[PDB]
Structure formats: structure tokens, C-alpha cells
Design a binder for this molecule. Structure first.
Ligand SMILES: [Mg+2]
Ligand SMILES: [Mg+2]
Ligand SMILES: [Mg+2]
Ligand SMILES: [Mg+2]
Ligand SMILES: [Mg+2]
Ligand SMILES: [Mg+2]
Ligand SMILES: [Mg+2]
Ligand SMILES: [Mg+2]
Ligand SMILES: [Mg+2]
Ligand SMILES: [Mg+2]
Ligand SMILES: [Mg+2]
Ligand SMILES: [Mg+2]
Ligand SMILES: [Mg+2]
Ligand SMILES: [Mg+2]
Ligand SMILES: [Mg+2]
Ligand SMILES: [Mg+2]
Ligand SMILES: [Mg+2]
Ligand SMILES: [Mg+2]
Ligand SMILES: [Mg+2]
Ligand SMILES: [Mg+2]
Ligand SMILES: [Mg+2]
Ligand SMILES: [Mg+2]
Ligand SMILES: [Mg+2]
Ligand SMILES: [Mg+2]
Ligand SMILES: [Mg+2]
Ligand SMILES: [Zn+2]
Lengths: 176, 38, 125, 136, 134, 94
RNA sequence: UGUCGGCUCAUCACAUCCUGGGGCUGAAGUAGGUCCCAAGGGUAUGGCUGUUCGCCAUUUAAAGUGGUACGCGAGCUGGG
RNA sequence: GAUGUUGGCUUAGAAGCAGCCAUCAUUUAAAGAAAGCGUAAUAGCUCACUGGUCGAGUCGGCCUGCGCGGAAGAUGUAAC
């Protein structure tokens, strides 16, 4: 509601193709496509996008609000892009990047390797830190989380894969 | 995960949610306040 | 909080010291400790200066009480006003040295004679 | 734990609990715990409850108990056939009809009283509400 | 940038002073005996507050300020310890001249506008520890 | 000052009263003085929020009945046993 | 409408004894406590007692709790 | 998110934050002798409270209508 009624400004060079409920947004950082929920109606005016409900639905305004956040992030994606930062806490935790595969040495027996899906690229400015760029917010977030899945950061020394920003609280050993 | 038929807010950081037709209580602060109805 | 009656009385107090005051200085109050602010309140009661931080849309109602109406665009941003009820000056000479001492905030726009003084020319006062 | 000092008769007919309550109003304290539902209060229940709201007020203000468990209930023990008389007297109860006032209270902050009464009602079998004494 | 309250001509016990401002890089004996050289003038038995200012080079400058409202109210009512039950149990007495002496000492140490504001803050610390103002 | 609007009751008895109470209206009476009694009906809500003040019981109010006011006091009032409700009000002519 | 227990044969449940997934812990690890999900398979030999039960010995990943005319005598036994 | 101030009591230490009692006054736009984490005690971290940006509705009770959880068993769905 209060979301759907703040329209999204489409900056120059940012291309909006509306076919039915199917949006395709294109730009310098790449291309993205999303089918909106059917309750929503989205219109192109000047260069801006405005979202409002359609009749025959109850939830029109929640669906709308979501549509707005979606396409807003879709705009940010193909302009600026997206970045997620992770870092590995603890001894002998290494990260390598070969093509789209990430090599994780996490202290298991076997090497742990993470295939990255299309539209996502990664780099390690260190041994202990990974960064991903990508257009798609949901996707890069997911990938990030799957990396966090392998070793989740822990209650005591903090060891694990954490987001660079992420607050980590520990606790002390049970005394004796 | 305290699983019980009366679920409540145990502090100011506990936030109630209905996920998939279950009422749970989620806390950022205190893992011990994590509850599900049942 | 503040009731409408609260706001009304306070608009009457700001309008009342505004009528009685010789000269005023509007400034940014942001990013400074209450220690240095009680320091400029001591340096305020010592210079005859009446110090205030007041709501903006309240100060449009109090400054509509004339002749400070040239200041109603100086109320966008956090507002700390120094009314010198005793002497003109001693607010405008105290604020530039307090903002150069702290190197925080601004001290944006003054008012004297019924006109507004731009930020680099407040050295007139 | 309340119970009649001495009685005319030792035992009683089961009787019915029908119709509504008398003493619907708060005549002593500023606040009262009224019963919405209809049921029998054992002495145990009333005592436990009075305790609960006595902890709750830190022994301040004042508490009245408007109800009394005057009617004796009997039970035959296990493994005993029917007949051979009426069962032995187990415990005492107070018949409660919708709209009785179980406890009264005053000399306390309202908020605290609503609280203490919630804690008191946790111990009671029947539906209850909070109420304030009125002028007339 | 630390603060402590140290007895008049005294310094260098282990639990009150040395560790507290000694984990901050401060030389301990210069603080100790330049503070007993400054506060030799404070009467024996009064804790006097000292504000220690440390810099990136560990050379410090401390402003020794006037003895507390509570310590000058211990001494101006004659007493030793104030009340364990303030304004319920009352432990001593000060006429308005002592409120005003303690509030000239603290006129050097307050935020107050007038000696009535400093006399009223010493009035507040006079109601805090139980003492009566007479 | 409190002003209560009312209508004259065309019916009586237990049935009338309980249909009244079902419709979110309730029966009351006006007696006292030289005159005859006058039975009237009221809106439960208005009055329930009106006696939600204390003065209602200590004061002279007015009742508008068929264009015509009467000035009265609150005499006694019977409330439903557990519900935030009013069964009835005795009004005594002021 | 054949009564306890053993024997032979089972079969169902899940309120799970083990193995499987998981949250919380006063969870350093090892080893646990408690709760959630799960019935696929697994689930001891003896001494004593007519025994079920129990107690004891020594096992095992564990020696689950119940239903089935306290399953099963036109299948066996007959100690009770 | 201030001064008196580490309020006094007590403690090897209590400094808003073991515990006991008071809980005043100052500069105030506002700042509890402090609502929680924190320390050997501090420091360190938010909160109450207020100024700014924002721009039109928001808060939580009362009374009711219909629904959700609470809700596990044995041949086979088997509680229209
Ligand atoms: Mg799921
Ligand atoms: Mg009868
Ligand atoms: Mg009767
Ligand atoms: Mg009749
Ligand atoms: Mg009838
Ligand atoms: Mg289960
Ligand atoms: Mg497990
Ligand atoms: Mg351990
Ligand atoms: Mg477990
Ligand atoms: Mg099995
Ligand atoms: Mg299979
Ligand atoms: Mg054998
Ligand atoms: Mg055996
Ligand atoms: Mg043998
Ligand atoms: Mg044998
Ligand atoms: Mg059998
Ligand atoms: Mg069996
Ligand atoms: Mg047989
Ligand atoms: Mg047979
Ligand atoms: Mg035989
Ligand atoms: Mg409203
Ligand atoms: Mg149900
Ligand atoms: Mg179940
Ligand atoms: Mg089944
Ligand atoms: Mg049908
Ligand atoms: Zn919580």
C-alpha cells in the first residue's frame, strides 16, 4: 500500500518491456524477467512505473506492494548490480575462485565445491573473504546463504561462514 | 523450541508470526524464546 | 508529548522573547554533546543571551510575530536560536567561535533590522 | 481451607445449579472478580486462588472472599458396589451461578488488580471477568 | 580519559588506583605524587575527585576538582557516614552558610547559574544522603 | 448536561422487553410526581456510554419524548448479571 | 462363549528402545538432558520361580510401550 | 541521552545497573540518582526523552459473526 503508491523511477538507458503480466527489464548490468501476480496492474508513464490493484481481487494491495519492491530491485540490479560479502572465521579456512566454481577448504575431509548459477560472478580479495556480484537480488542472496549453509557460524569462537556485516554473538563454555 | 498450546512474548524482542497455519514466536535476542504451537 | 495548549503557550514564549530581543541567530544544533551545549548555555547566561532549540513549524508561528519573518526558510534543518535580549551581537560573535571550536554543525542564517544575513556575512555581527 | 464450623445435617441432596446469581455487585472493595460461567467451587480451589492473589499484592490493600463452600459432597471409594447407603463426606463446595462476585479487593492500583485477578482465575474452574464497583 | 575519587594526600594502593588507570598507559607514580603534591591542601580523610586526561603519547594532564557534594556534606554536618536510610533516618545538619560554602567550592565545580543553583544542587545531595538543612 | 432521546412503549411484559433487548434497545420508566407513569425505550449504546460518567447518577438530565422533554434523575438501575449491559432504569421526575 | 503361564506362529498401532532428520540447552569436544519429525528394518542368552512380573548374571546398536477373546489348546503342552 | 556524582548505605569492589534507602536539584529541546547487556568494580552497548527528515492517518481496548492451534491407537480409507 504505502509501498505500491511510491512509484519507481526508471533511469535513462533502462529498458521496460511490458507484455501482459510479464515484465522484462534490460540495462548495462544485464537482463531480468518477472511475471507479476495477476491481481496487480502495472503501468508505464513518462519514465516511471506505477502499481495499483485490479478489480476482482481482495489482496490487490499486498500483491501490489510486493510487485513494487520486486521491480524496484530489478531496476537497481541492471543499473548498479548487487554485492554480497562473506568471510570465513577460524584456522585453515580457505576460499578459491576458478571460473564459476568456488573452492572451499572448510575442514571437512573432502574439498567442498560450490557451483554458481548463471548471472552470478565471484571473487576473493583474500583467502578468508568472498564477494559475489550479480544482477538478481534473490539469486545472489540465495547463493550466499548456500555458502553459509556448509559451515554455519557458531556459539563459541565464532568459527564459520558469516556475512561480512553480520553480528555474531557467542557464549562462554559451561563452567566445568 | 518450546512446543506448546499457549505461546507468548517473553520479552520486548519476541515477535509473533503465523507461518503455514502455525503460530510461532520468534526472537532475535534469545534462542530460548523460540516457540511453536502444538 | 506536547498538547496543542502546550505548543500554543510555547509559541507565545518564543514570540514574547522575540519581540523583546534586539537581535537573533539561527544555527544547526546537530552533532554536539550536552557538555559543550551547557558550556554555551553558561557562555549564554553570561552574555545575556537566551538560548533555545524549538520546533520548526512552531517557529513559523512564533516568527510570524514579526520582524523575523525573513528567517522562515532558515527553519529547514534542526533549529537552535540565540536571542540576545541584552546587547545586539554577543550571539553572532559567540556562535562562529563555538562552531570553529567544535568544527561541528553550521550556524546558517542570521536576522537583524528586519533582514536576513547570509552565512559568511554574519561577521557584520 | 474454608468449611462450616458445625452443621444441622451431615449430608445433602445433590441439588441442581440453575438460574442466576445474587450479589452481582461490588459492595466493599473498588474491584471484584465476577464469574461469567456456572460451576461448583471446592474449598481447595478458593483457597489456592486467594493465595495466588495474596502473593500478587505483596500483602497490601485488602481482599474479601464473598463465596462460601457450605454444601458437602460425598464419594464412595473405589471397588464399592452401589447402595449400602450414601457415600462419605469428601469435601465442601460452593454453588456458583453466572454473575456472582467471588472476591473483592481495594486499596490497590487498578492495573495491579487486573493482574492479581488474572493470576487468581488461573486456579478456578469457571469463566470469570474483572469488574469495578459503580455509583448506584 | 578516566576519572577516580582519591583520598586527600594519598595514592598508590593496588585495588583503588594502580590497575584502573594503569591499564590505560599512564605512569602511576607521577599521577600519585603530583596529586599528593596538589591535593596536600585538601583535608585528610576527604576523597577528592580527579579527572585524568590521557593522550596517544601517555603523557597525561589531570584536573583535580573540588571534593564531592557528599564528602563536603559529610564534613560540614560533622558526620562520618551519611544515612543508610535517607530522609527516613537523618544523620546530621548544615545551616545555609555551609550549603553556600560547599556550593562555592562546587561553584568552581557545578553547571549552575547562580550560587542558589549550586546551593540547590548541594541541597539535592543534602536530601540524597539523609542530612537535614538547618 | 445529558440529553437522552426516547420513544413511548406501545407494548409491555417479558416478550416485549426481550425483543427490545434483542434489537439493541432497552426499556426504562419515568414516574414520580403528580402525573402518571411513562414507560419508554432507549438506545442501549448511547446511554451505556453516558452512564459511563459519574454525574449521570447525581444530576438532573433531560429526556426527549415525542417533541417533549422531561427533567429527571437516575433512581435505580438493574444491570444484566455478567454482561456490560443495562436491563433497565428507574427515572424519578425531577 | 475352555481358565493362568510356556510353546509354535503371528499381525496392527505409535504415546519411538535402537538406527535416520532436526530445534533448544546450565551444548568446549567426547558423552548427554529435553522437545519436535519418523513405524523402513531391528529389538538377548541364562539362574530362580508354575509363573506373567521381578531379582540377579553376562550380553547388544537396542533388549520399546501397547492392541489383537489380557492374539493363538477343532495347533502343542498341563507346571499352575 | 547532560552536571552535582562514584547520591548515601554496604562492600576487598557497587561507579544508574549485588544488595538497602532516598530519588533531589541544576543546564535543559530533552536526558529515569536509570529500562536491559556489560565490568573484579569501571569502561563499553541500546532504552526512556527530545530536535531533525518524512508526509496522512495511527494506537488498543470493549462488544459481537465465522474460522485457526490445543487434537495420539491399534485388520482398511473409516469422525459428510
Ligand atoms: Mg515447511
Ligand atoms: Mg428443587
Ligand atoms: Mg437465593
Ligand atoms: Mg400481564
Ligand atoms: Mg416467555
Ligand atoms: Mg511421534
Ligand atoms: Mg538425534
Ligand atoms: Mg562439556
Ligand atoms: Mg537432541
Ligand atoms: Mg517395528
Ligand atoms: Mg523406500
Ligand atoms: Mg529357558
Ligand atoms: Mg528371564
Ligand atoms: Mg542347574
Ligand atoms: Mg525351575
Ligand atoms: Mg489367551
Ligand atoms: Mg500381548
Ligand atoms: Mg492356552
Ligand atoms: Mg481355537
Ligand atoms: Mg496340574
Ligand atoms: Mg480513531
Ligand atoms: Mg482443531
Ligand atoms: Mg501426533
Ligand atoms: Mg491407519
Ligand atoms: Mg451428501
Ligand atoms: Zn525474546
Amino acid at each position: 500500500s504505502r509501498v505500491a503508491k511510491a512509484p519507481v523511477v526508471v533511469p535513462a538507458g533502462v529498458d521496460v518491456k511490458i507484455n501482459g503480466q510479464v515484465i522484462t527489464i534490460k540495462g548495462k548490468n544485464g537482463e531480468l524477467t518477472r511475471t507479476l501476480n495477476d491481481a496487480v496492474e502495472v503501468k508505464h508513464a513518462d519514465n516511471t512505473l506505477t502499481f495499483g490493484p485490479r478489480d476482482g481481487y481482495a489482496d490487490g494491495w499486498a500483491q501490489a506492494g510486493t510487485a513494487r519492491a520486486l521491480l524496484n530491485s530489478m531496476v537497481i540490479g541492471v543499473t548498479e548490480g548487487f554485492t554480497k560479502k562473506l568471510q570465513l572465521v577460524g584456522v585453515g579456512y580457505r576460499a578459491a575462485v576458478k571460473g564459476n566454481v568456488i573452492n572451499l577448504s572448510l575442514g571437512f575431509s573432502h574439498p567442498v565445491d560450490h557451483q554458481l548459477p548463471a548471472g552470478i560472478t565471484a571473487e576473493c580479495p583474500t583467502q578468508t573473504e568472498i564477494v559475489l556480484k550479480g544482477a538478481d537480488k534473490q539469486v545472489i542472496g540465495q547463493v550466499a546463504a548456500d555458502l553459509r549453509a556448509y559451515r554455519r557460524p557458531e556459539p563459541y569462537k565464532g568459527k564459520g561462514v558469516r556475512y561480512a556485516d553480520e553480528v555474531v554473538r557467542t557464549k562462554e563454555a559451561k563452567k566445568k | 523450541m518450546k512446543v506448546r498450546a499457549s505461546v507468548k512474548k517473553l520479552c520486548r524482542n519476541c515477535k509473533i508470526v503465523k507461518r503455514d497455519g502455525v503460530i510461532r514466536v520468534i526472537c532475535s535476542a534469545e534462542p530460548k524464546h523460540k516457540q511453536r504451537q502444538g | 508529548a506536547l498538547n496543542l495548549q502546550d505548543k500554543q503557550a510555547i509559541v507565545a514564549e518564543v514570540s514574547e522573547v522575540a519581540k523583546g530581543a534586539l537581535s537573533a541567530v539561527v544555527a544547526d544544533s546537530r552533532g554536539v554533546t550536552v557538555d559543550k551545549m551547557t558550556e554555551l548555555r553558561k557562555a549564554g547566561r553570561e552574555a545575556g543571551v537566551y538560548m533555545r532549540v524549538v520546533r520548526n513549524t512552531l517557529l513559523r508561528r512564533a516568527v510570524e510575530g514579526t520582524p523575523f519573518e525573513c528567517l522562515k526558510d532558515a527553519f529547514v534543518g534542526p533549529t537552535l536560536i540565540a536571542y540576545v535580549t541584552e546587547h545586539p551581537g554577543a550571539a553572532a560573535r559567540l556562535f562562529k567561535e563555538f562552531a570553529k571550536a567544535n568544527a561541528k554543525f553550521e550556524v546558517k542564517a542570521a536576522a537583524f533590522e528586519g533582514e536576513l544575513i547570509p552565512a559568511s556575512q554574519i561577521d557584520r555581527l | 481451607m474454608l468449611q462450616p464450623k458445625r452443621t444441622k445435617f451431615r449430608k445433602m441432596h445433590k441439588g441442581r445449579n440453575r438460574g442466576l446469581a445474587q450479589g452481582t455487585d461490588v459492595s466493599f472493595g473498588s474491584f471484584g472478580l465476577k464469574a461469567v460461567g456456572r460451576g461448583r467451587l471446592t474449598a481447595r480451589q478458593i483457597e489456592a486462588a486467594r493465595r495466588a492473589m495474596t502473593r500478587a499484592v505483596k500483602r497490601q490493600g485488602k481482599i474479601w472472599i464473598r463465596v462460601f463452600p457450605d454444601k458437602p459432597i460425598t464419594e464412595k471409594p473405589l471397588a464399592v458396589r452401589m447402595g449400602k447407603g450414601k457415600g462419605n463426606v469428601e469435601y465442601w463446595v460452593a454453588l456458583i451461578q453466572p454473575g456472582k462476585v467471588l472476591y473483592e479487593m481495594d486499596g490497590v492500583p487498578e492495573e495491579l488488580a487486573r493482574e492479581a485477578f488474572k493470576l487468581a482465575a488461573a486456579k478456578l474452574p469457571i469463566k470469570t471477568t474483572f469488574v469495578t464497583k459503580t455509583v448506584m | 580519559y578516566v576519572k577516580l575519587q582519591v583520598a586527600a594526600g594519598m595514592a598508590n594502593p593496588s585495588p583503588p588506583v594502580g590497575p584502573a588507570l594503569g591499564q590505560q598507559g599512564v605512569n602511576i607514580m607521577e599521577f600519585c605524587k603530583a596529586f599528593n603534591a596538589k591535593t596536600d591542601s585538601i583535608e585528610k580523610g576527604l576523597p577528592i575527585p580527579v579527572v585524568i586526561t590521557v593522550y596517544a603519547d601517555r603523557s597525561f594532564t589531570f584536573v583535580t576538582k573540588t571534593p564531592p557534594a557528599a564528602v563536603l556534606l559529610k564534613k560540614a554536618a560533622g558526620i562520618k557516614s551519611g544515612s543508610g536510610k535517607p530522609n527516613k533516618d537523618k544523620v546530621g545538619k548544615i545551616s545555609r552558610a555551609q550549603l553556600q560554602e560547599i556550593a562555592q567550592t562546587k561553584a568552581a565545580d557545578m553547571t549552575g547559574a547562580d550560587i542558589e543553583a549550586m546551593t540547590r544542587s548541594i541541597e539535592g545531595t543534602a536530601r540524597s544522603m539523609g542530612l537535614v538543612v538547618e | 448536561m445529558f440529553t437522552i432521546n426516547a420513544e413511548v412503549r406501545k407494548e409491555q411484559g417479558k416478550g416485549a422487553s426481550r425483543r427490545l433487548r434483542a434489537a439493541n434497545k432497552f426499556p426504562a420508566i419515568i414516574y414520580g410526581g403528580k402525573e402518571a407513569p411513562l414507560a419508554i425505550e432507549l438506545d442501549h449504546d448511547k446511554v451505556m456510554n453516558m452512564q459511563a460518567k459519574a454525574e449521570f447518577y447525581s444530576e438532573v438530565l433531560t429526556i426527549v419524548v415525542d417533541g417533549k422533554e422531561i427533567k429527571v434523575k437516575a433512581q435505580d438501575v438493574q444491570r444484566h448479571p455478567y454482561k456490560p449491559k443495562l436491563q433497565h432504569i428507574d427515572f424519578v421526575r425531577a
